[PDB]
Design an enzyme around this catalytic site. Sequence first.
Site, PDB file in Angstrom:
ATOM      1  N   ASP A 181      -5.107  -5.196  -8.469  1.00  0.00           N
ATOM      2  CA  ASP A 181      -5.427  -5.532  -9.852  1.00  0.00           C
ATOM      3  C   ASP A 181      -4.900  -4.427 -10.776  1.00  0.00           C
ATOM      4  OD1 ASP A 181      -6.863  -7.780  -8.932  1.00  0.00           O
ATOM      5  OD2 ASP A 181      -8.797  -6.781  -9.070  1.00  0.00           O
TER       6      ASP A 181
ATOM      7  N   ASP B 155       0.812  -1.219   0.000  1.00  0.00           N
ATOM      8  CA  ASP B 155       0.000   0.000   0.000  1.00  0.00           C
ATOM      9  C   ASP B 155       0.857   1.286   0.000  1.00  0.00           C
ATOM     10  OD1 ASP B 155      -0.556  -1.552   2.868  1.00  0.00           O
ATOM     11  OD2 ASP B 155      -0.281   0.636   3.223  1.00  0.00           O
TER      12      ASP B 155
HETATM   13  N1  LIG Z   1      -3.651   4.488   0.265  1.00  0.00           N
HETATM   14  C1  LIG Z   1      -2.860   4.512  -0.824  1.00  0.00           C
HETATM   15  N2  LIG Z   1      -2.222   5.640  -1.211  1.00  0.00           N
HETATM   16  C2  LIG Z   1      -1.443   5.663  -2.299  1.00  0.00           C
HETATM   17  N3  LIG Z   1      -1.262   4.575  -3.051  1.00  0.00           N
HETATM   18  C3  LIG Z   1      -1.829   3.380  -2.772  1.00  0.00           C
HETATM   19  C4  LIG Z   1      -2.674   3.289  -1.611  1.00  0.00           C
HETATM   20  N4  LIG Z   1      -3.106   2.029  -1.541  1.00  0.00           N
HETATM   21  C5  LIG Z   1      -2.591   1.349  -2.579  1.00  0.00           C
HETATM   22  N5  LIG Z   1      -1.820   2.159  -3.319  1.00  0.00           N
HETATM   23  C6  LIG Z   1      -1.091   1.742  -4.554  1.00  0.00           C
HETATM   24  O1  LIG Z   1      -1.626   0.505  -5.024  1.00  0.00           O
HETATM   25  C7  LIG Z   1      -0.603  -0.475  -4.995  1.00  0.00           C
HETATM   26  C8  LIG Z   1      -1.218  -1.774  -4.603  1.00  0.00           C
HETATM   27  O2  LIG Z   1      -1.655  -1.567  -3.281  1.00  0.00           O
HETATM   28  P1  LIG Z   1      -1.909  -2.764  -2.226  1.00  0.00           P
HETATM   29  O3  LIG Z   1      -2.959  -2.245  -1.243  1.00  0.00           O
HETATM   30  O4  LIG Z   1      -0.543  -3.248  -1.735  1.00  0.00           O
HETATM   31  O5  LIG Z   1      -2.623  -3.898  -3.116  1.00  0.00           O
HETATM   32  P2  LIG Z   1      -4.020  -4.632  -2.718  1.00  0.00           P
HETATM   33  O6  LIG Z   1      -5.145  -3.953  -3.501  1.00  0.00           O
HETATM   34  O7  LIG Z   1      -3.655  -6.059  -3.162  1.00  0.00           O
HETATM   35  O8  LIG Z   1      -4.199  -4.421  -1.220  1.00  0.00           O
HETATM   36  C9  LIG Z   1       0.457   0.008  -4.010  1.00  0.00           C
HETATM   37  O9  LIG Z   1       1.750  -0.552  -4.278  1.00  0.00           O
HETATM   38  C10 LIG Z   1       0.364   1.493  -4.239  1.00  0.00           C
HETATM   39  O10 LIG Z   1       1.070   1.833  -5.399  1.00  0.00           O
HETATM   40  N1  LIG Z   2     -12.541 -15.802  -6.030  1.00  0.00           N
HETATM   41  C1  LIG Z   2     -12.449 -14.845  -6.957  1.00  0.00           C
HETATM   42  N2  LIG Z   2     -12.146 -15.066  -8.240  1.00  0.00           N
HETATM   43  C2  LIG Z   2     -12.033 -14.078  -9.165  1.00  0.00           C
HETATM   44  N3  LIG Z   2     -12.217 -12.786  -8.895  1.00  0.00           N
HETATM   45  C3  LIG Z   2     -12.515 -12.463  -7.650  1.00  0.00           C
HETATM   46  C4  LIG Z   2     -12.658 -13.461  -6.586  1.00  0.00           C
HETATM   47  N4  LIG Z   2     -12.966 -12.854  -5.431  1.00  0.00           N
HETATM   48  C5  LIG Z   2     -13.024 -11.544  -5.767  1.00  0.00           C
HETATM   49  N5  LIG Z   2     -12.781 -11.339  -7.072  1.00  0.00           N
HETATM   50  C6  LIG Z   2     -12.716 -10.040  -7.732  1.00  0.00           C
HETATM   51  O1  LIG Z   2     -11.729  -9.321  -7.012  1.00  0.00           O
HETATM   52  C7  LIG Z   2     -11.835  -7.992  -7.485  1.00  0.00           C
HETATM   53  C8  LIG Z   2     -11.148  -7.089  -6.493  1.00  0.00           C
HETATM   54  O2  LIG Z   2      -9.761  -6.989  -6.817  1.00  0.00           O
HETATM   55  C9  LIG Z   2     -13.315  -7.764  -7.640  1.00  0.00           C
HETATM   56  O3  LIG Z   2     -13.445  -7.085  -8.877  1.00  0.00           O
HETATM   57  C10 LIG Z   2     -13.941  -9.155  -7.670  1.00  0.00           C
HETATM   58  O4  LIG Z   2     -14.838  -9.439  -8.780  1.00  0.00           O
END
Ligand SMILES: Nc1ncnc2c1ncn2[C@@H]1O[C@H](COP(=O)(O)OP(=O)(O)O)[C@@H](O)[C@H]1O
Ligand SMILES: Nc1ncnc2c1ncn2[C@@H]1O[C@H](CO)[C@@H](O)[C@H]1O
Length: 345
Positions: free
Chosen positions: A299, A266
Site C-alpha cells: 500500500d 520485497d
Molecule cells: N524487508 C524489506 N526490506 C526492505 N524493503 C522492503 C522490505 N519489504 C518490502 N520492502 C519494500 O516495500 C515494497 C513492497 O514490498 P512487497 O512485500 O513486495 O509488497 P507487499 O506488502 O504487497 O508484500 C518493496 O518493493 C520494497 O521496496
Molecule cells: N478485503 C479487503 N478490502 C479492503 N482492504 C483490505 C481487505 N483486506 C485487508 N484490507 C486492508 O489491507 C491493509 C493491509 O495492506 C489493511 O490495512 C487492511 O485494512
Amino acid sequence: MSSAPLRVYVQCNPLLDVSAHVSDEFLVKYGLERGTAILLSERQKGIFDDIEKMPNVRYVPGGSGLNVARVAQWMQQAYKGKFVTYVGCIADDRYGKVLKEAAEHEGIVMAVEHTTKAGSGACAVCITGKERTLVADLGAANHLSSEHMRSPAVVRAMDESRIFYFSGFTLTVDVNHVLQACRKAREVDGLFMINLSAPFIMQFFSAQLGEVLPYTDIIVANRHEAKEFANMMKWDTDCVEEIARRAVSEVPYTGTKGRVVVFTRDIESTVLATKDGVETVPVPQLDQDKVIDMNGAGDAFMGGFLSAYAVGKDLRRCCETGHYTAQEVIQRDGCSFPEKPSFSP
Ligand SMILES: Nc1ncnc2c1ncn2[C@@H]1O[C@H](COP(=O)(O)OP(=O)(O)O)[C@@H](O)[C@H]1O
Ligand SMILES: Nc1ncnc2c1ncn2[C@@H]1O[C@H](CO)[C@@H](O)[C@H]1O
C-alpha cells in the site's frame, strides 16, 4: 521547484484495523495461513471477540486503498484538499467517524457513502513477529450503491480526475462500480490503475477481474500475486519477468496510454514492464533489524508511486518513490510516517 499534482481518484473498502499480537497456535485455531488476507467466513466465527479480549489491542483506521491515499497525500502536504479523492461506503458509527476524520485531517476529500444496512467494516490483524495476517469483515463497504456512484460529488470527482486507482479488493463488492470508473477514465483519457491485492482475487474473482483488465493501463502486484495470476491464466512459467511480459502483450488491452506492469518483490528488485521491454528497479539496501512491520508495504509503495506519477515523473522514478515510501512505513509500527518526506521525486 516542484509541480502541483494532478487530481487522483481512489476507490476501495474503508476498514478499521483491529490489531493484536498472537501465537501460531491462534492462526491455526482460526484456519489462517500466515501473512495472507482473506474475507471473514464461518470458519473464523468469534475471531473479533477473541482479539478484542487481548491486551494492547489497537483500533486503527485502515483499508488498503485508504492507506494508499494517505501515503500519497503525505507526499504532497502542500495540497491538502486539492489532490486525492476517496470513495467507499461506511456507516455513521464509532468506526466510520474515526475513518472519515483521520483521512480528512490528512487532506483527503472523502466522497464516501453512509449506509444503515450494516456497521462500518473492520479487519482483524493478527501480528506474529513482523508478519500480519488479515481477516476482513467488509460490513458497510459491501453495500456501496449505484446511487452513490451516480451522485454529484462522485461524478464531479471522476470528471476532474486524471488518475484512477482501484484496489483489486473492490472486485468482491460490485464489478459494475469499477466498470463505471473504467469508462469515465476513457472518456477523459485518464489513467486507470489496479492492484491485484491478494491471491484469492485471482482464485475466486477472476471473472470480475477479467472484465476490468482490458481497461487497465497499469497493473500492480507483488511476487505471490503474480504467480497466482499466471496460474489463473494457465501460463506455464516460473518467472516473474516472463509473467509481466505476458501481462503486457497477452492480456487484452483496449487503451491507448500503454499497458504497464509493476511487480514488487520485497527485498529484490521491482519488475517494470511495458511494450518496449522489461526493466528492473533495485530496492535500496536496508538493515533488516530496522524492519519492524511488513504489513502495508505494498500500500505504501502504491502511494509513493501515485504521488510521483501525479507530478509527471517517469515510471522508473515512480517505482523509486514507491520504494522510498514503503521503506519508511516498514520502519514503524503501523501506518506511520515522519512529519515530512525526505525525498523529492
Ligand atoms: N524487508 C524489506 N526490506 C526492505 N524493503 C522492503 C522490505 N519489504 C518490502 N520492502 C519494500 O516495500 C515494497 C513492497 O514490498 P512487497 O512485500 O513486495 O509488497 P507487499 O506488502 O504487497 O508484500 C518493496 O518493493 C520494497 O521496496
Ligand atoms: N478485503 C479487503 N478490502 C479492503 N482492504 C483490505 C481487505 N483486506 C485487508 N484490507 C486492508 O489491507 C491493509 C493491509 O495492506 C489493511 O490495512 C487492511 O485494512
